[PDB]
Amino acid sequence: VKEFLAKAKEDFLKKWENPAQNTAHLDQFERIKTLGTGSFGRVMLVKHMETGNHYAMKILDKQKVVKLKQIEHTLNEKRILQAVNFPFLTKLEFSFKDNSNLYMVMEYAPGGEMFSHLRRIGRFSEPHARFYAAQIVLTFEYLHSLDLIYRDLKPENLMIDQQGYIKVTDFGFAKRVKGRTWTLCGTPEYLAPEIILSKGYNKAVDWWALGVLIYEMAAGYPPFFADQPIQIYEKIVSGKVRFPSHFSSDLKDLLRNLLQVDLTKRFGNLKNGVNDIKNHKWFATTDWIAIYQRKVEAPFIPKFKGPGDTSNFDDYEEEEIRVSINEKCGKEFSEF
């Protein structure tokens, strides 16, 4: 495991220092449907014509990225995802840019997002939540060993694949940092108290966010909610959490140790690091090798309909991919 991590780091470092660039072109793909949107732009199902492989293609508008002050963060996202390789995230298969846009092409996860399944079902059993949680613990172990902080854990970002496993998606705030960092970013419900309080923070925010996720998966709502973000932040910084009565003892105990304001006590952050989590009692029934190797049966598999089936996603207005005759923001994105 120390050894697995060492080799993964050597592989990651080579790509990190010598990033792949301009590895496809838009005309090599057929666009089939928009799967999702946000401030970043759009994610589309596309088919690579040469192979007939389907992929998710994220399309960013350079001028919008500039207006949003996300140049460096977008550069981070692309440089990271082209360099990683892990079962529960989607590295870049291809990337490129044109006059107007930035493109990132990744493995397509057909099952939809956890968020939609979670809301519809209400909540997940502790076993069901533990299956997903384990995939997160392993991805964070991997990411943090590479000096990467993720900074946006939430159900909306966890895409379900055909086997019922998870892909962590949207690395718009991921950063390679060896010390502390200061950017106010993330999603209100999932922000650690250090972020809200404008302290310099580290990877421990990712472990706090796991606490929020496990809670939300098991309860059906988040530990800290309200109608407006400022109400949510007061609740986070006070820090008092109430657990549903259906929560097991072991679940509450882990959550007390993840949702811990005291950084000297927050699990994931201590001298034993990720093993405080992996060896906590709530995970006692978890075989971490079988999870990595995807040999455990998923508590929920979405129905096979086709490798390009989009029915586990919403419908969105389908707008064009307009490519200017003039190159926008050349210097800003020169390394992309």
């Binding site: 949003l68 909306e156 309860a219």
Partner: peptide, 20 residues
Amino acid sequence: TTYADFIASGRTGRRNAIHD
């Protein structure tokens, strides 16, 4: 119930990342 308070709240749909 807490469940009823959540479902009646304005934040049961997909939540966006923050902007400053």
